[PDB]
Coordinates of C-alpha atoms and ligand atoms in Angstrom, one line a residue:
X1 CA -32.6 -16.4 -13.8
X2 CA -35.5 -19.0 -14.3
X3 CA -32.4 -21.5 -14.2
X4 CA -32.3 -20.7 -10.3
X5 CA -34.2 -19.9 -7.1
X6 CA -32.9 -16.9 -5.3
X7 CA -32.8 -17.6 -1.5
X8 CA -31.4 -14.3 -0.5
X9 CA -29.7 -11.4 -1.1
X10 CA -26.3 -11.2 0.1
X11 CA -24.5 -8.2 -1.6
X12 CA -25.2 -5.0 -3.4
X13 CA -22.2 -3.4 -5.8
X14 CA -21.4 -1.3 -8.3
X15 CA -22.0 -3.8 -11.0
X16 CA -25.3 -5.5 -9.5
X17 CA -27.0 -7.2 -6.6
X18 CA -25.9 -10.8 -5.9
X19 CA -27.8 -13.5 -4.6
X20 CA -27.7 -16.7 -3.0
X21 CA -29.3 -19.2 -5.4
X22 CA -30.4 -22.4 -6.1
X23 CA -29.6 -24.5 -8.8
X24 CA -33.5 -25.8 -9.8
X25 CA -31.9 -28.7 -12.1
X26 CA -28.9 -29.9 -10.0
X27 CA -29.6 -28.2 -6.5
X28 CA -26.4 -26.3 -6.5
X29 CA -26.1 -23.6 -4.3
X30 CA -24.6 -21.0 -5.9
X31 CA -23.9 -17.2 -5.8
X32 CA -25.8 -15.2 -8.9
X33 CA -24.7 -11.6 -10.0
X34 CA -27.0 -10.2 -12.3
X35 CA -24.4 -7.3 -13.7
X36 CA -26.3 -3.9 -14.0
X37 CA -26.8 -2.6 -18.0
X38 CA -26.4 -5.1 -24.7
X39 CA -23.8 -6.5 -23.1
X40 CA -20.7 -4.8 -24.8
X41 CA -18.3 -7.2 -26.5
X42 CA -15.1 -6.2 -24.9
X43 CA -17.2 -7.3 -21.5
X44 CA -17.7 -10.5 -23.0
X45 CA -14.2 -11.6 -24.0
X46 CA -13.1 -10.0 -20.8
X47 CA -15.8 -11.8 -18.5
X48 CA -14.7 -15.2 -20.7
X49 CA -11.1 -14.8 -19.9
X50 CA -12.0 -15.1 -16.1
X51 CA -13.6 -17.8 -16.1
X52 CA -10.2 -19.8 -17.2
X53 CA -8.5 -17.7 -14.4
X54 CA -8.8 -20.6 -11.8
X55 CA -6.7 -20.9 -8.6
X56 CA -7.9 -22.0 -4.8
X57 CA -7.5 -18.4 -3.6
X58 CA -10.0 -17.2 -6.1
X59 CA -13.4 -17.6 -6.1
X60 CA -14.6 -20.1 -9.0
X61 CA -16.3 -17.9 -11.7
X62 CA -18.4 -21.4 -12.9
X63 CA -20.5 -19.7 -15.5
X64 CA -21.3 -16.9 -17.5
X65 CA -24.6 -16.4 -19.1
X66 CA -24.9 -14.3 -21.9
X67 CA -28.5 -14.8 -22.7
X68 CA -31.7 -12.2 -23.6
X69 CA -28.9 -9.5 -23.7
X70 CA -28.3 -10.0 -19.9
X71 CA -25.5 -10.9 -18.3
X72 CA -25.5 -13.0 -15.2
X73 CA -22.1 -14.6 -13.4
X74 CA -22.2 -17.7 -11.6
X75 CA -20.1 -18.2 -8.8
X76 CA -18.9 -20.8 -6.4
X77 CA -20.8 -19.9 -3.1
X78 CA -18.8 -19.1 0.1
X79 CA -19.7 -19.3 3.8
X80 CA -18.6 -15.6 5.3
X81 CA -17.3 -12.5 4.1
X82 CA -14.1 -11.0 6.0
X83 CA -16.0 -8.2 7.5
X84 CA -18.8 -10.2 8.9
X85 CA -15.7 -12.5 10.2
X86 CA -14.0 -9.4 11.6
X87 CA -16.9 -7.8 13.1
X88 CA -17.9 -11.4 14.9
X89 CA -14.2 -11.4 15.9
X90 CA -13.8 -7.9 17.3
X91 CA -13.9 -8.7 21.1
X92 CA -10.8 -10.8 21.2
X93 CA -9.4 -10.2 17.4
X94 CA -8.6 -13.1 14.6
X95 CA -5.9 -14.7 16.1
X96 CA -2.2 -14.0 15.2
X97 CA -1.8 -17.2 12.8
X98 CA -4.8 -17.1 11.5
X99 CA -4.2 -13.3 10.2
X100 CA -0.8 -14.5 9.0
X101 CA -2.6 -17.8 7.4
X102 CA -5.3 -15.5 5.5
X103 CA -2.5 -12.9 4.4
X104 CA -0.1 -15.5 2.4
X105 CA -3.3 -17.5 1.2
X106 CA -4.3 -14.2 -0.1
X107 CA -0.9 -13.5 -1.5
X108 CA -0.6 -16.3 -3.2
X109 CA -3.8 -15.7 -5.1
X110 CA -2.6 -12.3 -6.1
X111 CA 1.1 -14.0 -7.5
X112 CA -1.3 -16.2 -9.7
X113 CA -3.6 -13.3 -11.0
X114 CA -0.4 -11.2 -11.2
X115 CA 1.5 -13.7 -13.4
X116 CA -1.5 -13.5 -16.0
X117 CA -1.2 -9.6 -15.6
X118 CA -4.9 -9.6 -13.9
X119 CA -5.7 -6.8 -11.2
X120 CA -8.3 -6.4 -8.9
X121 CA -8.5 -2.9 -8.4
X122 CA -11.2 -3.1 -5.9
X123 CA -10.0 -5.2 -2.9
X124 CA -11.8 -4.9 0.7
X125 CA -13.0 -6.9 3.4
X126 CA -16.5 -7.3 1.6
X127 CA -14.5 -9.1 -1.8
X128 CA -12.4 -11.2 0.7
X129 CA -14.6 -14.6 1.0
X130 CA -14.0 -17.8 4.1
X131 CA -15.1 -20.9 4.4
X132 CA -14.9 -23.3 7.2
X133 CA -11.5 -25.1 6.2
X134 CA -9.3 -22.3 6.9
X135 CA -9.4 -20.8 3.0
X136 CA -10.1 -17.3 2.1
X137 CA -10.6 -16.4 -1.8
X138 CA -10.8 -13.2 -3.6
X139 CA -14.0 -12.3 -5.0
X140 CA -15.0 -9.9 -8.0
X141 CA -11.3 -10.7 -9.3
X142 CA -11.0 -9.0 -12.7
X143 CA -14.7 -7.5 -12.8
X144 CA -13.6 -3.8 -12.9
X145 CA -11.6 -3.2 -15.9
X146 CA -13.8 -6.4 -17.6
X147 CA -16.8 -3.7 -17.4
X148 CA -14.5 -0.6 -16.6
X149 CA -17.2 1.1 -14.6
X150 CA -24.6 2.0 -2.4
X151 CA -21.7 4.3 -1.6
X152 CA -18.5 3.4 -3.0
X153 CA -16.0 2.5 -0.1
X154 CA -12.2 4.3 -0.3
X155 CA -10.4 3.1 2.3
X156 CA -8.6 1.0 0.9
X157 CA -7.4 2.8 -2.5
X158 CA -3.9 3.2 -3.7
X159 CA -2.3 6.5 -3.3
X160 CA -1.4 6.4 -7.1
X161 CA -5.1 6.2 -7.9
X162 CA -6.0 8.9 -6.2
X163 CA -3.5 11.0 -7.4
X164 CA -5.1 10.5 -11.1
X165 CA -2.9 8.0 -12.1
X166 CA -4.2 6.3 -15.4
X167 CA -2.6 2.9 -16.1
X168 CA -3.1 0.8 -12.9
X169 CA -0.3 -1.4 -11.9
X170 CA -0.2 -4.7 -9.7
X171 CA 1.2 -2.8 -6.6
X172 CA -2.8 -1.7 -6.4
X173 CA -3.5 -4.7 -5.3
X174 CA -0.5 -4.8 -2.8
X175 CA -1.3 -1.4 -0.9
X176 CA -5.2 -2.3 -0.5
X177 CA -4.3 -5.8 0.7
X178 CA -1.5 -3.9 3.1
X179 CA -4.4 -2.1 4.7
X180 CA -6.7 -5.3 5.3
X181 CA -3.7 -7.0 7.3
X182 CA -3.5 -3.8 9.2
X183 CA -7.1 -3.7 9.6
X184 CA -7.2 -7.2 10.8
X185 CA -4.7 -6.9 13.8
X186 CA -5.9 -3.7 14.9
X187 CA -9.9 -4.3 14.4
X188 CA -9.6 -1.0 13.0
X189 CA -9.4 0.3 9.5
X190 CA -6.5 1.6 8.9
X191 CA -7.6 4.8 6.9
X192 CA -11.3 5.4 6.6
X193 CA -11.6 8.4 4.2
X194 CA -15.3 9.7 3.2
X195 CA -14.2 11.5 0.4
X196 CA -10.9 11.3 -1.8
X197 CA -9.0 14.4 -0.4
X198 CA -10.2 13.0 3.1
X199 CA -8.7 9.6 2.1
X200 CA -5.5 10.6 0.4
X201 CA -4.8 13.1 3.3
X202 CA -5.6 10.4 5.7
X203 CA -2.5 8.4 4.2
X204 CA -0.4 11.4 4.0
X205 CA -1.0 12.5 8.0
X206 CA 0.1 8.1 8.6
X207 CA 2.6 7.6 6.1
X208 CA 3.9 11.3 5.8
X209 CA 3.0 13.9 2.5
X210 CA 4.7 12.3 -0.2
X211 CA 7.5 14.3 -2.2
X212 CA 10.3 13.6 -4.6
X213 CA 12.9 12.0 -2.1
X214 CA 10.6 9.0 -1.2
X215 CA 8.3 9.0 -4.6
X216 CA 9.8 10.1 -7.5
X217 CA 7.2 11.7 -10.0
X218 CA 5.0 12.1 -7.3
X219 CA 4.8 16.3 -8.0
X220 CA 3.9 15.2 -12.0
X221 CA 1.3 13.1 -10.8
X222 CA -2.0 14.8 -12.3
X223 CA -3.7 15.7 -9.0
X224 CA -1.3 16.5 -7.5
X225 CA -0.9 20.6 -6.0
X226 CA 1.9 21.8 -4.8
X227 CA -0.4 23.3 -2.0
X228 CA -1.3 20.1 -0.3
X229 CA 0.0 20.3 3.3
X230 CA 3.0 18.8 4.7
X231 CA 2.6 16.2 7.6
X232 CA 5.2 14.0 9.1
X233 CA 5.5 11.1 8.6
X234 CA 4.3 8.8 11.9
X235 CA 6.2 5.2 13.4
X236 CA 4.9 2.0 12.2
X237 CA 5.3 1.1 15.9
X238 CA 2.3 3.7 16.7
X239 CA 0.3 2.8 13.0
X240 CA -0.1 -1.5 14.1
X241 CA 0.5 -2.0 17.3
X242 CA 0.9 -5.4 18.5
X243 CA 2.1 -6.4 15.3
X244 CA 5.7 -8.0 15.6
X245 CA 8.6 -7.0 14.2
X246 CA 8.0 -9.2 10.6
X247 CA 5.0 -8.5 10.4
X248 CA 5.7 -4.4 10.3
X249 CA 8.7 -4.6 8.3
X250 CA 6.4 -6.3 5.7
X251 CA 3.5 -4.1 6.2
X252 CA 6.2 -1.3 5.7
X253 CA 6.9 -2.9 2.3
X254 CA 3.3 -3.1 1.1
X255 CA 2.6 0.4 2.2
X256 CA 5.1 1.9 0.0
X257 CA 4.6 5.2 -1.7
X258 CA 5.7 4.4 -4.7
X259 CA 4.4 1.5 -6.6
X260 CA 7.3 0.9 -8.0
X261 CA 9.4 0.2 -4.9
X262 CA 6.4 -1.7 -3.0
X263 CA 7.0 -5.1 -2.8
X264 CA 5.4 -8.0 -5.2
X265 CA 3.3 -10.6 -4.2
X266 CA 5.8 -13.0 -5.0
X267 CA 8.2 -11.5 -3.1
X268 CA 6.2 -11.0 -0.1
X269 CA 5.4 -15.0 0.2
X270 CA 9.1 -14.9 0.6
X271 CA 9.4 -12.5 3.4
X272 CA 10.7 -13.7 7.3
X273 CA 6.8 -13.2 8.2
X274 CA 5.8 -16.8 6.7
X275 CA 8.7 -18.7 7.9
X276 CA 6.1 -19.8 10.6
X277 CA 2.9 -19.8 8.5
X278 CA -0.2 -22.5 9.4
X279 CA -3.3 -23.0 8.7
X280 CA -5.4 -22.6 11.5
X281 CA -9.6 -23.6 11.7
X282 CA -11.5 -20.3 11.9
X283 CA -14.5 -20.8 14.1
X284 CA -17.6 -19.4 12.2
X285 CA -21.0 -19.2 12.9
X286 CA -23.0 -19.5 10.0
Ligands
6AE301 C1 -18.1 -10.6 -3.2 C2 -19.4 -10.1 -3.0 O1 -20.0 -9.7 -4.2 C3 -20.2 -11.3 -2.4 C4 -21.6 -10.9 -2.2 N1 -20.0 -12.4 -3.4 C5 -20.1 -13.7 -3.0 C6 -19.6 -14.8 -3.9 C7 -19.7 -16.1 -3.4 N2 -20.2 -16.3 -2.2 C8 -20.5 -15.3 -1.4 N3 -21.0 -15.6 -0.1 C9 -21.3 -14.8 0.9 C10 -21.1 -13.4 0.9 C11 -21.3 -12.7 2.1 C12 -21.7 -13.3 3.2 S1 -22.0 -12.4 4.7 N4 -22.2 -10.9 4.5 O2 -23.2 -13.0 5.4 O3 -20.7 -12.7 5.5 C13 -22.0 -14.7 3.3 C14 -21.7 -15.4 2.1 N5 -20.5 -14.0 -1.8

């Protein structure tokens, strides 16, 4: 901490408060977690094993500092978050290719965390992070099951998860990620749950209640009752209008019940959707 001088403070988590920092030796302008507690050792190796996790869709994890039995992260510093870009962009909404642009860039960082078997676990608008060029990069990659621990947002868990599944899989990442597109060309989210029955019954009024036929094990699942009610399910034409056809077939494929049959990140960079894919200037105001 005496290593920097905190400018401001731009986030507040379950693992600690960042800040924008300065560098006093180099200048660098930095972001600085201080992670909220020593530090167990698990963490450690954990924490250290992200630090090697380096792509240009996720945000550069430059140090860790394991001193006075605190731990603080270091991390490349980014301009915007995706919510402050969405909420200056809700008038006219982020253009079409620039949507389609932050999607694959966003997929394309998942494939590489994917191929290491890394999750997120916790993606949202808030962990999504732009900078003037056109990039986006995912932020807090790996922190949750590193540390495996002001109100915690829900809207954009996996049905799985809140079913009491145990073992997360890579299709976590998928379905949140699935929700942000929608999110992005509607300029609204697509289910904002305030509690975890609201959530999960939020999906299951959209996407339909789940059963057997289009999830098997679903009934096993361990919160799972028999008693929970029985909606239809609804047209992705009604759930993301004006999304194109591509665009809905892929959501479709993202927003899959089951895990197992919701599509891969590799995959999905595949998909008719990208065929025309650019990379458009965002205009921020910083
Ligand atoms: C991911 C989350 O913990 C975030 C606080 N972490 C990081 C990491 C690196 N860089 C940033 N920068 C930054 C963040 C938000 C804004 S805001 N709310 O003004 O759009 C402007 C810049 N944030």
């Amino acid at each position: 901490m005496e290593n920097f001088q905190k400018v401001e403070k731009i986030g507040e988590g379950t693992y600690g408060v960042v800040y924008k920092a300065r560098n006093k030796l180099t200048g660098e302008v930095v972001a600085l977690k201080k992670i909220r507690l020593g530090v167990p050792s698990t963490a450690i190796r954990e924490i250290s094993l992200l630090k090697e996790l380096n792509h240009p869709n996720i945000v550069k994890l430059l140090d860790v500092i394991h001193t006075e039995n605190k731990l603080y992260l270091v991390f490349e510093f980014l301009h915007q978050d995706l919510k402050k870009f969405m909420d200056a962009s809700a008038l006219t909404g982020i253009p079409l290719p620039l949507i389609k642009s932050y999607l694959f860039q966003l997929l394309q960082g998942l494939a590489f965390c994917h191929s290491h078997r890394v999750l997120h676990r916790d993606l949202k608008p808030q962990n999504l992070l732009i900078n003037t060029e056109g990039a986006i990069k995912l932020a807090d990659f790996g922190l949750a099951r590193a540390f495996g621990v002001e109100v915690v947002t829900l809207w954009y868990r996996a049905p799985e998860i809140l079913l009491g599944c145990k073992y997360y899989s890579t299709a976590v990442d998928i379905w949140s990620l699935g929700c942000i597109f929608a999110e992005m060309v509607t300029r609204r989210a697509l289910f904002p749950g305030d509690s975890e029955i609201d959530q999960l019954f939020r999906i299951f009024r959209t996407l339909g209640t789940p059963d057997e036929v289009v999830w098997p094990g679903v009934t096993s699942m361990p919160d799972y009752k028999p008693s929970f009610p029985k909606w239809a399910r609804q047209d992705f034409s009604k759930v993301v209008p004006p999304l194109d056809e591509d665009g809905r077939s892929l959501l479709s494929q993202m927003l899959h019940y089951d895990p197992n049959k919701r599509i891969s990140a590799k995959a999905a960079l595949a998909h008719p959707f990208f065929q025309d894919v650019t990379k458009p200037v965002p205009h921020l105001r910083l």
